[PDB]
């Protein structure tokens, strides 16, 4: 990515509704960590990058 894509984040999403999740670390064009979830309906949504809850949703996707 060539700039920051996430402005606001949300926290209220059931893992059952998430198809995939992208964890983007700080880079040369973005001084923010960003977490983008693609929902089962196809919508892309920015999530709060708090390490425990992001790892909860990540582990549940990263397995079952």
């Amino acid at each position, epitope marked *: 990515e060539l*700039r*920051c894509l*996430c*402005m*606001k*984040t949300t926290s209220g999403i059931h893992p059952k509704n998430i198809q995939s999740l992208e964890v983007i670390g700080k880079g040369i*064009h973005c001084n923010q960590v960003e977490v983008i979830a693609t929902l089962k309906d196809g919508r892309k*949504i920015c999530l709060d990058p708090d390490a425990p809850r992001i790892k909860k949703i990540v582990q549940k996707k990263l397995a079952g």
Partner: antibody
Amino acid sequence: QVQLVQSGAEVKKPGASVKVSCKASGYEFTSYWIHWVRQAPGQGLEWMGNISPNSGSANYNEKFKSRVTMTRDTSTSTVYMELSSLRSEDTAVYYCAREGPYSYYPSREYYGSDLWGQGTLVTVSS
Amino acid sequence: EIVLTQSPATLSLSPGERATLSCRASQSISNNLHWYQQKPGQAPRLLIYYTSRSVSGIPARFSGSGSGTDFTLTISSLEPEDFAVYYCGQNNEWPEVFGGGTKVEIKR
């Protein structure tokens, strides 16, 4: 009233530092990026960097990275730009501009900067 | 990084005439190209965003278009207030980049 109100004109000696403020009013502060754009006399526009009023995260132009700091104050809805080790080439009008409104939906389609401050003239001289 | 090249540097026309301003990008910037107007003593003002999208408070006579790395700003009929400097600006990637500007002057 929807506006970006900048602090007054500044005179600084070479090697000194300047801190310019930009106060937002009449809109949702956390929903728009705040860019710092400068215009040297009779010249075009140059982006210095930006700051998210939501996260407080600043992104800088590599050209200025070594001597610029952008910060934000949620309590007053104010963003600041500090430029240090000032030189003649830093004499310009400094603008703040908002880009948004953005939500929690990521995008690769962007808005322009629809609202600009009045500008702050910064004169660097011995 | 991105280099935005505007042409011509000066456009000399009469009020009521049609104005066509050009912007060329060094690389692709998707459709994230925006148009600004600046008058002497004033801050830049957004006219068109995302290549061709309309801006709140801006008159109908301003429109934009652009395929790939070539972009265009059209003023269908110049008003006396339209003789000013126009910039193209990209925000597809940071750092944001502006063109060198095009001055639109009254022909005489």
